[PDB]
Design a binder for this molecule. Structure first.
Ligand SMILES: C[C@H]1O[C@H](O[C@H]2[C@H](O)[C@@H](O)[C@@H](O)O[C@@H]2CO)[C@H](O)[C@@H](O)[C@@H]1N[C@H]1C=C(CO)[C@@H](O[C@H]2O[C@H](CO)[C@@H](O[C@H]3O[C@H](C)[C@@H](N[C@H]4C=C(CO)[C@@H](O)[C@H](O)[C@H]4O)[C@H](O)[C@H]3O)[C@H](O)[C@H]2O)[C@H](O)[C@H]1O
Ligand SMILES: *[C@H]1O[C@H](CO)[C@@H](O[C@H]2O[C@H](CO)[C@@H](O)[C@H](O)[C@H]2O)[C@H](O)[C@H]1O
Ligand SMILES: [Ca+2]
Ligand SMILES: [Cl-]
Ligand SMILES: [Cl-]
Ligand SMILES: [Cl-]
Ligand SMILES: [Cl-]
Length: 496
């Protein structure tokens, strides 16, 4: 469950948050395949309740009403087409599996659902699965309200309702089997693995019991005997009762400490400095690298949901975000996930974005297609960070340097740092309020290399900055603190 099952040599996934299946299929073919991306995390593909107040928020997709593959992203045929087309160009599909719960316990009964299935939340009836009251944890929960009152009590976190959502009785083989049947349908379609939503809210052994029922991956695209990649969403910043490590036996775990601490460092908040990153990884108290799924931001915390707070860097802070994403994609720690977002109208009231519910770009609730501009950006308010040169080229960097060790660290004792990956790549950052002008050991063979942050190698030449590396492996890096992108990255495949 720990191996990502990407094509050999492909080292990242992108979250194409709220994208439609046909757009992802096209994106695999025209972009992600050719640009070396390993895979796509998709939004929940199972039927959800329609939320009309507020009007179609993103988060309605975390309120399941059946396991039918029919959502605002598309129907089952479109989903299958996507998985087929993406796998056929070497880009894997990872599903966001919403398995801890069904919809809100206070929701109305009816067929206000994305495929038209009936449900009666008050009576715990989901006939399209089917589930009945017997399949939920209302009895087992010991709080007066039926909700989680204290994260200090692991029983309540797992057995009570998370924000009022009906909590499935994951101890029951019936429930485990209903979930496995859904996940196995997806595996047989060709999905490579799963993000297990809300894993903190399930017992590790209940998750294990579900995972033990799972098929091997489809041999049209994977070697025989391949197990699905599992990454469990567990928020554990270091000060609550439930630990990430409780989940290591099932697969990887999201390391939320990563983006929280990196954001603080890059923002230079709380006295933090980039020079402190020399021992990034387990030296910062993180989980083992071979258990970690890492990311700068995710779909929750880029809009103030989940955890990390204001330190989280996002596309709204584009300059610093590119620096953080670049550091992450260069550093060997973890398996990397890059976010791909949409814009929304933020409205901060006493520090809270009261528009944090706004759903994807839409015409009257119908999700807009992703249009591609001549300059390779996207229209219709899709941000497409994974198309930014500075991020795409660092996705390629990580593939180029795969397997090479952290090497040749340098810092100025403040916020200028550099390091390499064996003899195959080197990166240099200036996050101080003054000039960087230093001659550094890169670990690379002598030659002239294209800086892949400012440009590209195009045939015989570089379209941006060029770095001349001496025969001894040293090079000067000159980066102004007023630079648009105050970091430079070179690697073996950017050499002229
Ligand atoms: C969002 C994450 O929440 C939890 O994280 C905790 C940390 O665990 C903790 O250490 C600390 O950092 O606080 C964090 C935030 O509280 C959780 O551990 C983590 O898994 C979460 N991310 C996962 C999980 C979910 C669930 O699938 C996603 O949550 C999102 O979707 C929710 C469902 O739509 C959305 O909630 C909306 O709907 C519910 C129903 C509503 N509650 C009202 C309704 C009912 C009855 O119907 C009443 O009984 C309730 O009392 C009412 O409040 C919410 O108000 C509404 O917003 C939620 O906001 C949204 O984040 C998440 O996307 C996943 O990644
Ligand atoms: C300076 O560096 C340290 C790591 O050397 C950062 O501390 C991190 O590591 C410890 C390890 O347990 C953890 O307890 C801290 O919360 C984490 O930040 C400091 O923050 C840097 O100031
Ligand atoms: Ca639960
Ligand atoms: Cl249970
Ligand atoms: Cl357990
Ligand atoms: Cl097999
Ligand atoms: Cl996540």
């Amino acid at each position: 469950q720990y191996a990502p099952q990407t094509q050999s040599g492909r080292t990242s996934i992108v979250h194409l948050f709220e994208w439609r299946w046909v757009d992802i299929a096209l994106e695999c073919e025209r972009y992600l395949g050719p640009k070396g991306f390993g895979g796509v995390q998709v939004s929940p593909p199972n039927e959800n309740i329609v939320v009309t107040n507020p009007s179609r928020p993103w988060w309605e997709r975390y309120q399941p009403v059946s396991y039918k593959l029919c959502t605002r992203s598309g129907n089952e045929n479109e989903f299958r087409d996507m998985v087929t087309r993406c796998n056929n160009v070497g880009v894997r599909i990872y599903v966001d599996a919403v398995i801890n719960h069904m919809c809100g316990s206070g929701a109305a009964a009816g067929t206000g659902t994305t495929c038209g299935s009936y449900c009666n939340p008050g009576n715990r009836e989901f006939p399209a699965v089917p589930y009945s009251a017997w399949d939920f944890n209302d009895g087992k929960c010991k709080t007066a309200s039926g909700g989680i009152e204290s994260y200090n009590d692991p029983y309540q976190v797992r057995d009570c309702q998370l924000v009022g959502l009906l909590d499935l009785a994951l101890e029951k083989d019936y429930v485990r089997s209903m979930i496995a049947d859904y996940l196995n349908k997806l595996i047989d379609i060709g999905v490579a693995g799963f993000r297990i939503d809300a894993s903190k809210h399930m017992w590790p052994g209940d998750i294990k019991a579900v995972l033990d029922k799972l098929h091997n991956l489809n041999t049209n695209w994977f070697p025989a005997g391949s197990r699905p990649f599992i990454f469990q969403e567990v928020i554990d910043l270091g000060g609550e009762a439930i630990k990430s490590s409780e989940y290591f036996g099932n697969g990887r775990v999201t390391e939320f400490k990563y983006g929280a601490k990196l954001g603080t460092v890059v923002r230079k908040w709380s006295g933090e400095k980039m020079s402190y990153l020399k021992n990034w990884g387990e030296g910062w108290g993180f989980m083992p690298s071979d258990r970690a799924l890492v990311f700068v931001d995710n779909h929750d915390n880029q809009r103030g949901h989940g955890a990390g707070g204001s330190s989280i860097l996002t596309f709204w802070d584009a300059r610093l975000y590119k620096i953080a994403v670049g550091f992450m994609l260069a550093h060997p720690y973890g398996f990397t996930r890059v976010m791909s977002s949409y814009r929304w109208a933020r409205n901060f009231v006493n520090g809270e974005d009261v528009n944090d519910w706004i759903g994807p770009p839409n015409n009257n609730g119908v999700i807009k297609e992703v249009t591609i501009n001549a300059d390779t950006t996207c229209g219709n308010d899709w941000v497409c960070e994974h198309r930014w040169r500075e991020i795409r080229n660092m996705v390629w960097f990580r593939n180029v340097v795969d397997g090479q060790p952290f090497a040749n660290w340098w810092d100025n004792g403040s916020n200028q740092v550099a390091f390499g990956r064996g003899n195959r790549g080197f990166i240099v950052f200036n996050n101080d309020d003054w000039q960087l002008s230093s001659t550094l050991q890169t670990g690379l063979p002598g030659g002239t290399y294209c800086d892949v942050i400012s440009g590209d190698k195009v045939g015989n030449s570089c379209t941006g900055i060029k770095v001349y590396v001496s025969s001894d492996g040293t090079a000067q890096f000159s980066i102004s603190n007023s630079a648009e992108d105050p970091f430079i990255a070179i690697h073996a495949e950017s050499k002229l």
